[PDB]
Amino acid sequence: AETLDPLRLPLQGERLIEASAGTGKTFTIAALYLRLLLGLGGSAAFPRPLTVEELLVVTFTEAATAELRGRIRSNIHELRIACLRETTDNPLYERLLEEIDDKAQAAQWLLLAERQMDEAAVFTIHGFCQRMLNLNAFESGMLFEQQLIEDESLLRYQACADFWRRHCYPLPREIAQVVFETWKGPQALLRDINRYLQGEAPVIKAPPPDDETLASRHAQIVARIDTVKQQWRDAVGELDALIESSGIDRRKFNRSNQAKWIDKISAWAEEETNSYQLPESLEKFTPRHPLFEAIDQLLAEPLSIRDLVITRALAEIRETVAREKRRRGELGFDDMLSRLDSALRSESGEVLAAAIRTRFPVAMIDEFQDTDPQQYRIFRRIWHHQPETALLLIGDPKQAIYAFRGADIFTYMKARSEVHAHYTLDTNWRSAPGMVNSVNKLFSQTDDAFMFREIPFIPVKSAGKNQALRFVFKGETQPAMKMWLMEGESCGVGDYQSTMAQVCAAQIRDWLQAGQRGEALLMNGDDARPVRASDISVLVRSRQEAAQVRDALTLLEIPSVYLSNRDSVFETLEAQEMLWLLQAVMTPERENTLRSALATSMMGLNALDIETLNNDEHAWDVVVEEFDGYRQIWRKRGVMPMLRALMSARNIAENLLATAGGERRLTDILHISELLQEAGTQLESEHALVRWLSQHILEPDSNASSQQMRLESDKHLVQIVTIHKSKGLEYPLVWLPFITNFRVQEQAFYHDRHSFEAVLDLNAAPESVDLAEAERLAEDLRLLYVALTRSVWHCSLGVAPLVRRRGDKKGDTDVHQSALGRLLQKGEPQDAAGLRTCIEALCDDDIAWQTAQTGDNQPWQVNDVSTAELNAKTLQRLPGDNWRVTSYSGLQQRXXXXXXXXXXXXXXXXXXXXPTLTPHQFPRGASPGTFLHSLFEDLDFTQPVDPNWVREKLELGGFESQWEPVLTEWITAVLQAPLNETGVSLSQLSARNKQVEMEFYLPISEPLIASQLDTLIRQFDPLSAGCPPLEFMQVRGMLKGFIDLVFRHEGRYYLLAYKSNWLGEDSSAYTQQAMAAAMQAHRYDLQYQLYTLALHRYLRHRIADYDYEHHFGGVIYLFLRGVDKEHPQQGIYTTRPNAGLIALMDEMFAG
DNA sequence: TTTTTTTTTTTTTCTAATGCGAGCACTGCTAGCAGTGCTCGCATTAGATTT
């Protein structure tokens, strides 16, 4: 191994950089990145400068991608600034500038990079394969649009039920009897194999042959026991044994059992008494005869169907899932990586690789100590060969804690084997000069602490920037590390979790109270800062642990967050209260479903409130009323407006904040509301939303957005976080209360030392159990390391004489099975006293141990807060006046009051009196009318009608052929009808004189008031005598409309508008009278007058020397259904604006 | 194609380990008996991760 200079590293081929924690591994990535952008290092430099989009960086967490992206952004910026200033105040940039040749061109490339930084390539693996597939699809053999799915547990469970249906339901009674014992149903089976369904499939040690069924195995074991049954039945009834005291004479009664126990094969369980007849058992207390020894053969291998079922099911469920996801064309996290691996694996995949070597002719993988077999197979297959591509693997093998997630150390060690070059970073930059020496001391206690020959520990040296770091608590400095030793002899896990959590809390509030007085300080040299509850972090292994920490820690009135919390809001009680409320406001009529909502802690009502409110009817009616207004807000304005109104009126948003802790509760309420919007839009119903909320109250899921928000950022908080979620992070003061604890793995899963392949032994044979438990322990060490390197100034950690074995007083302390204990005892069992001494041995000036003494004084001393007077400003002017763009439709609107305006007539008369090719029968609505119009839109008037053209319109319309012969006739009647007094046929109109569907915008300047208009209307209009004055609110703005048709005949223009409607009638129900009736009913009066104004202004605009009276021909409403070959008048209607009404009207809209 | 009623509660783990208690065989010490060494069985207690 050689030491590393960032600027000396050749970037060619594969390169491994290894170094301990806090050594700046992440920190160097920046420097190499810059170097790559500029093509620097000379001999060590890459052949050619690279573009930001060609640099691949792959990091472990989505958060890390964000951070590193930012840091690289900043560093590029600063370096550019320096290149323009030619000097800089930072040493690394200074050396870069010494290496750089031309500073100007350098600054140019940098600028360009800085711009490119948006698309800059940084990913995780699961974020990399994702992109890469969707990037090059053919090669990868993917669809182009992949719909992701994040819930793979439901598909998986589905498949497990499918298996357990086809491979279990067929079983006859007797085999089923055996299946039942090992697991009830697939709900449990899934729980057993679940870690093995996900990620790379394991290899199974000594798998059953492929052809063996359940009935086969079962018949086998049937006979295996049967032989012993006959045999024991034959040899029974004789004492040839040498009788011994300790073997108790009543042992012969056991034999009665066995000769009795031999009846049927139906049982899978041999008797406990059989253990007595083992020649290894008895001879310890007389070889007997062979079968006496055969029982030992029978009891040597546990009799089970288990391995076979886990094998068949594990192979099947995996496939089935993959197939169902193929059918939907979906994808998933493990499935992403898997699919890219497979894609490369395939013969075609070699093309694929070639593209990537083009896309990223370098890659820098960070946090590589966590690596998967698949991952390394990929990165190798891509970059292991070919020139001009580099590869940079960055990792500390000491830190790989993720084995549970499928990562494996052994494949890292493999890569470490196949890389010729190693590089090492010497100095820890992260933490105090004390903390370095502490850790070094603790891991130097034994030889080969990490108990992998390939993972040697080395001493590291603090930096010079950190030399002055110190932490002070009540004056004199506190040693960098303090181990809190528990008192007493034997300790169970529970006692330990109570006490140590508690003590941690007591210590934490002391630091705080001394932090508000400014006594305790985090000091770099003379500089300082008090210890806020922010800078403290508490690292725990699991969730239950963390809750155990918080409950005690909030009991002392210190607000605390848990950063790994995946719990979802809907699991809380506030979601439930929200349900009670929404459910009440929905139907306040029901006495019960309302009162329930009133009793909620959210409403904050006493028992006296609800009591009296059950008595006086007036109040109860008032409540019912207010909720009835809430339903209104609910229907009109949506949801969140309602809950807003309720919160204001009830004053709850304030009363919670008054209440202690209620701040959290209020955050939950607001959050839930915010979700009720997101689901509120997509669902149209008011009611289906209450449908929805319940369904989420039942299944909280895991999912991201419904996960709880942090309670408050106002106050600095205790950031209580799991180890794994602390990786790559930094925590100035750090607590490890429960670190002593351990978990002995009963499952047997390990790696072969030779092949380095993940091997599962479905059989419990103790060897493999050992081979695994060694792994569990080494991993626990790596947890300890990572946990200790997190701190900057101070880290405290608990130590206890923990006892796993249930015997009380021995001298057994299992602490040597703890990760930390083994480091204190150098892997030697001791007594609790020996524990205390071994702690005392290493304790000098850094490590300092105090006994763990429970105490309680005061939760904490807030001393409260002072604020001010405060007020909200209030708008004075109206928010805005009326400016609206409307059509005539925005005029009739609706009438609130005695008179309501509708197209239809309310009065109805019943009829008691008692060829389908007719116009009246045509469908109705906006849809049918839009079709009818759209015909005449392209339709040609001079040519007759082509029924084929009809059929292909109706076909497009979706209308059947029930119409085509019915239509093509009618249209001709339309086009052939003469019009007005001129007698014009629609047929006679040349496309030169046609104008189809004119859209116009007509400005209305000063506000247009109804009564100031309808008097002008009624005055000159005979038709406006009918019905009240039109009523529309004051409006100022633009007006829209579509002329159906405009055409000129005899040098004289016309205005044409089609109308259809009329559900009830066919015949003369269209007359001169009834047309004028309906016109007055739907207020087409104002409509045609308005158009005439528009057409008027448009002609006045277009036609040089235009005059209204000379050029204008009147207005024509054509009721399509109204057209009948029998009567020329029916369906057509014509009126002329007075020319005296337009004269004043136009002036009115002008001012 | 017509129409009436009525209100609420229930359950909850399994496996394993020890500690002791009861009963017995032997063996040594002063043929029987007391003790010890022993051994099994019944109840009680404890613990069940990590994106």
Ligand SMILES: Nc1ncnc2c1ncn2[C@@H]1O[C@H](COP(=O)(O)OP(=O)(O)NP(=O)(O)O)[C@@H](O)[C@H]1O
């Ligand atoms: N060369 C350097 N000069 C100055 N400060 C540095 C240098 N290298 C690292 N640091 C600082 O030291 C700390 C640790 O750096 P970091 O890059 O996280 O190391 P690391 O190896 O990635 N730690 P981890 O992710 O836990 O292994 C950071 O707070 C850096 O700012």
Ligand SMILES: [Mg+2]
């Ligand atoms: Mg890092």
